[PDB]
Assembly symmetry: D2
Homo-oligomer: 386 residues x 4
């Protein structure tokens, strides 16, 4: 087959297969899953680990003894299966108190509470061995213009991230942060709407080396953006700390379909990029099995996430290893793209007449790039017609 | 009226009112405009200056004496009118040689030529007194995945920008660079697709202080993004070096409608932001009078750009100066957004029981944000119903 | 200013002001509203009527005796205020049994249950005085290709609507049906995604005269379509039976902002069309008070809906009434557009040398359309700068 | 592998391979192709026929004698290769006289000239054997609200199409007309923007049986709509007279990528629908070889169109033929979907206690639809992992 094993580093959040199907126009179609039950069936499917929001593991408003009790049972299922916890995050979007945001809520007291709720879950994550802590600011934003002064809201967002950075620094924790962008939903527009806005923001933080991004396929596609290109810019910057894989069919509400569904060619170019750049983190799936499905359809969907990644990995490796493709890449001058434009510097370039006054503009313009032949070769490989 | 005068700093490119109406499915509907003729009618409309692509002023492939001749006549119309040239740029997209890009073309020789063509126009811009040099990489991108390795293409883009930065440094020129983002068109996806991706890229340049962004209203809207929010993040970073104003009606081809058309409420929040943050650069219009129009419709459209900015400036100033609005802003706690979340630092925050263990979550959650009242106040002011 | 009266016939759904605020990523921020409180509060706001889904009025699962009690409570409040009930609809989307649809579910027994639930509410709506019954097939569709054969699903959809028409015909009821299109959400793709698809479908029912459309501003805008142009096509067809007004800020999840918010110029062009076409049905607002709001924010938002419709009505009447505008329209040849192209038939046209042989194409091509001056006059009227 | 033959009836427009590459921001990258070279080259590629706009074949402005010479040259090449001409159309969008439209221009004389230009090419198309004549009203629309009264424009559009039907009826021609929808570009909004709007319009013409639609993959996707679902509705209506195949990577400018590129899974679902519905018309490709390509890239791209259609045909036949799939379909109750909801009428339905009173809603709600396993089986077939 294309069978997962933990070496594939496939991970899933408790809230993915655990989604009960409650949406904006409909009630839950499935019962709540026990986290222990999820750890056991994911290990049987070939998964390497699980991730969690604090409120996915410990129900909101738990007493301290109830909390110890929930953390205990989960720690026990983990130990018995060999499953790891590579990443964790905080829910700063479900409770009504976060209706205007967490870190950038207009009310000062909710911002402080958002910070304490996050620090408590960071202590727990480190204990369970997580090395990345994600922040998805889903309620940071606005539906209307005067409701949020975005320059002041970015001051408060930077304040919170700097505060968390000094906190993990004083404790000597080995954990880093990853910002998860999303352009809209549940808010009209969300602050730091794309991988680019998140990367630019991090450069203004006090300790920038502590923070990176955790891009999600469907989010960048909700802005009509090219997800493989955004990932290539995060890898060029040395900031791809983690990644969430799923599917989306266009610019519409966030679907969280299983990976491979939605834009299939972009899932092929994404796998090709992650494998050839040697990304070594978790291949995390942040998807929601459709609410039409019962619990068997939930595990069939999660199995399909891992399967589609292993089929696409195989076809992309076969495409880059093919002699005919290597030759087509040379024909489209991808080798010359790797050459410096002007390693001898600006003074030699200005003195070079072949670069301007003697350049044959029309002879260069008539060279076809042979890109369509190359792309049909990539299509034959993806489709297994070679 | 709402009459422009040069104090308003309104500027226009030679290619805007000069557009002949040639589009992907149709030929030109208007004759070419003489640049001198454009300088004279813009000064009569109340404009402060004009901008240009090299090939808008000096037709491609001019001989050196033809070039001196074209630069002469234009310099003469400028002097006789008092019009300034605040900005200039290079056309690295119209000639067939640039069909795979300029700075990131796969062919090494075209990249060198792209750099020499740009340096020649930088010398001319400085002479005419321009203080900002724009780069719009419209052909930097791809329609297919293997045709452009984006990590290597970002190396070549950084190489070119660093080369231009050492060039203006050695010459002692007082000019800075501004990157103009666009998500797609004419290419399938364009590198540095949004204000965020451009800001993140600049932080990886050798002399980052030399570069900023020049956002265009319609471009960010072609990705469904909020343009006032993107401008607020460029102002927060200290990188809004210039701005292009126009209109767009949604996610579709780039329309370049006159400013005020398209999303009218976003043009209101944009003017409110630029005026209250005290932006001091040109209010440049990069628009195309519809090809249904004759030359009188061309000057009526350009006049409407300046008029809509002066009406929106008036209504936004009236909105922020209204006592009822100041009170509604206090009611929605925009004042508390300006307070530091935790100026006493993380140790006091962790010791503060009112922040977590004694926080009344439900009492805070029931506080309405009063945002709808605030936004109807902004709507009454925009519409002049107060 | 601008107060709503009775002949304006603004109406609101029980579910609009009654939205408690739970969305895909969060829980309710408001308590449930008793329908009689909504009838009273809306009567005091100047509303002329209320509409309802069956389950907004009678909780799902109610016994025939609890049903009777909720209905008696509701008709007392109507009786006491003089509020009308112009339209009603069925909830065939919330209960998990409708997870794959109502009328086009794959399970035959769920389809029969859908039709019995609908027929039961039709009888109720008729005695209350509603003359329009709406269908919004929100769950009719799929997230994947083989899950629904769309030709067979359109035979089931037609069969359902024909059975409904047979039933109102046998009972002698005066009621007409209106289909409300939506392109996606909660399903990946919904059947009859736009006004055009719903109009074309009606033409295939056995009694087409019983069916029309109930378009919603936001829904056509979720496909990036022009909502005023869609409504002109439904009015051209004789099928605008009802309309839902609200706002949407682009292609993204369905926002249901209050009327006037979102695309403000499309709202002016819509009110200009409806008022100049003499539409006489209800002006119904199907919107959701943002969950950031308490109940005072809910009534402020609902009042804002009516106010924005009246300001835009005044501004559009002023635009059409201005002699400079009526002159601008003649300059743009909108009067020549109402002349028949060739009222004397195709033989006359063929014989006419001035229509081809002797037509002066270049003179005709050089005529400007003067559309920009005409649109800036409309901009000055909407903004009250005229 | 996979070679095109004659009974596949792949056809191409003279304008597709003949695209010289000038786009809104750049000049031609290729020389013009002589039509007889295109007929010969396409015959050698395995194409069954060519289509044409009048001005692709006879340059605009030609004298009746130059016209005769281009037509004689073209019919010799067809005669010599055995290539057919299944469809033809009129260019009513390039010449500046059509800047405001053809059939719905505001100038009455341009509308009459539009109809004479069309009638002249209809006579030509009939003697060549075309049985479908396409209309793409690319300039019919507006960029602003008062520039076009859409109800009067639909009376002019209907008047034009009725005059065309009167003309083919009087001549006894066997030709049918097909409308090709497009939502926008080159106009801000185009009239009859989708398959649904065009279908609904046809129903209002005097002879509806003479008119159907010619949908294009990319155009429905520019509105974010599901192209397989639109085509199933046109087939349900009896109106899929012709179809244009290509690719589009999202909501943006009209790309016209080769067939298979863009949304690859929508292309599989389209070929599965067309082949299982037994569509018999041409498989026409209306695409543009990217301007990065020389002429060898143009023929590689055009061959790729046919190859992708044949691979997807094989993969969809294999999916429908697999017993595990046909079992999965029964598990998802696609067979219950083809059963009448209530073939014994509405009195039987009303009397049935098992349809409402005694219906076990919770048992029915708990049934899983098994749609994910069925879609991963379709994913494995498209990818040849089965
Ligand atoms: O759109 C929803 C987000 O992607 C959500 O599922 C986040 O992943 C989670 O809050 C942790 O990052
Ligand atoms: O979409 C087109 C671009 O906006 C173009 O008009 C640039 O403005 C110009 O090349 C200079 O920046
Ligand atoms: O997207 C939601 C629909 O618009 C819904 O609110 C309908 O209004 C209702 O079911 C009656 O048509
Ligand atoms: O957007 C462009 C249209 O698709 C055009 O290529 C039509 O195919 C042609 O005019 C016949 O309909
Ligand atoms: Mg998501
Ligand atoms: Mg632009
Ligand atoms: Mg809605
Ligand atoms: Mg097209
Ligand atoms: O998500
Ligand atoms: O532009
Ligand atoms: O809605
Ligand atoms: O096209």
């Amino acid at each position: 087959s294309y069978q997962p094993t933990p070496e594939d580093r496939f991970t899933f959040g408790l809230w993915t297969v655990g989604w009960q199907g409650r949406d904006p126009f409909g009630d839950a179609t499935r019962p709540a899953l026990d986290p222990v039950e999820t750890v056991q069936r994911l290990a049987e499917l070939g998964a390497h680990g699980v991730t969690f929001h604090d409120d996915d593991l410990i129900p909101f408003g738990s007493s301290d003894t109830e909390r110890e009790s929930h953390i205990k049972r989960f720690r026990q299922a983990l130990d018995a299966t060999g499953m790891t916890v590579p990443m964790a995050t905080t829910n700063l979007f479900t409770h009504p108190v976060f209706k205007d945001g967490g870190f950038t809520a207009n009310d000062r007291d909710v911002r402080r509470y958002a910070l304490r709720k996050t620090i408590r879950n960071i202590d727990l994550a480190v204990e369970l061995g997580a090395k990345t802590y994600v922040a998805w600011g889903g309620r940071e934003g606005a539906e209307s213009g005067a409701a949020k002064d975005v320059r002041v809201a970015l001051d408060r967002m930077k304040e919170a991230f700097d505060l968390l950075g000094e906190y993990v620094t004083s404790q000597g924790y080995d954990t880093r942060f990853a910002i998860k962008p999303k352009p809209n939903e549940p808010r009209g527009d969300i602050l730091l709407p794309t991988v680019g806005h998140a990367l630019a923001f991090i450069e203004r933080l006090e300790r920038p080396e502590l923070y990176g991004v955790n891009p999600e396929v469907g989010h960048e596609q909700m802005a009509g953006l090219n997800f493989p290109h955004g990932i290539a810019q995060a890898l060029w910057a040395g900031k791809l700390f983690h990644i969430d894989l799923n599917g989306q069919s266009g610019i519409k509400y966030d679907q969280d379909l299983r990976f491979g569904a939605g834009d299939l060619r972009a899932a092929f170019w994404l796998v090709d990029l992650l494998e050839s750049a040697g990304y070594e983190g978790p291949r995390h799936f942040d998807f929601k099995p459709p609410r039409t499905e019962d619990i068997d359809g939930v595990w069939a969907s999660a199995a399909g996430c891992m399967r589609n990644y292993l089929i696409l990995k195989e076809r992309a490796a076969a495409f880059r290893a093919d002699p005919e493709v290597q030759e087509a890449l040379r024909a489209s001058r991808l080798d010359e793209l790797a050459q410096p434009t002007a390693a001898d510097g600006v003074q030699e370039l200005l003195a070079d007449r072949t670069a301007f006054e003697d350049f044959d503009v029309d002879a260069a313009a008539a060279r076809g790039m042979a890109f369509e032949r190359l792309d049909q070769l990539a299509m034959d490989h993806l489709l297994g017609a070679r």
